[PDB]
Design a protein around this nucleic acid. Structure first.
Length: 88
DNA sequence: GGTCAGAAAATCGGTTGTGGTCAGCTGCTGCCACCGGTTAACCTCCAATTCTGCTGCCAGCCT
């Protein structure tokens, strides 16, 4: 309990609370188990009717579940420039 | 065949009157988002080169 609770509290930059981390993990497991059986990526309608929620709610959860990229990686593959100098 | 009260114009401004109108909370009420605690068969040790300076190390004259 302590390890999983603290991993939810500290694993992310923009902190997501524990209950939304629970529903993100549940949506991930549901999507993986449906993708294995279908042979295809499941639609938001199929995920929403599986998890007993709305497709808008599924889209909001998949919106919240995104990690930031970094400003310091060299997006020029020659290494001369980094990403933080290409932002207006 | 000329002077004085009344009537009739905007004009600047006060009343006023109500007719909504919009917000400013105000409960308040349901709800929903978030934080904290709890679960009792057992199973107890990790995933390239070039140059300069510094330190560790071993023989070996000197006392």
């Amino acid at each position: 309990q302590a390890i999983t609770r603290a991993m939810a509290d500290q694993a992310r930059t923009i902190r997501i609370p524990v209950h939304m981390v629970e529903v993100i993990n549940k949506l991930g497991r549901i999507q993986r188990e449906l993708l294995q059986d279908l042979g295809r990526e499941p639609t938001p309608e199929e995920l929403a009717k599986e998890m007993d929620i709305t497709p808008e709610k599924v889209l909001e959860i998949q919106q919240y579940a995104r990690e930031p990229i970094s400003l310091d990686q060299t997006i020029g593959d020659e290494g001369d420039s980094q990403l933080g100098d290409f932002i207006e």
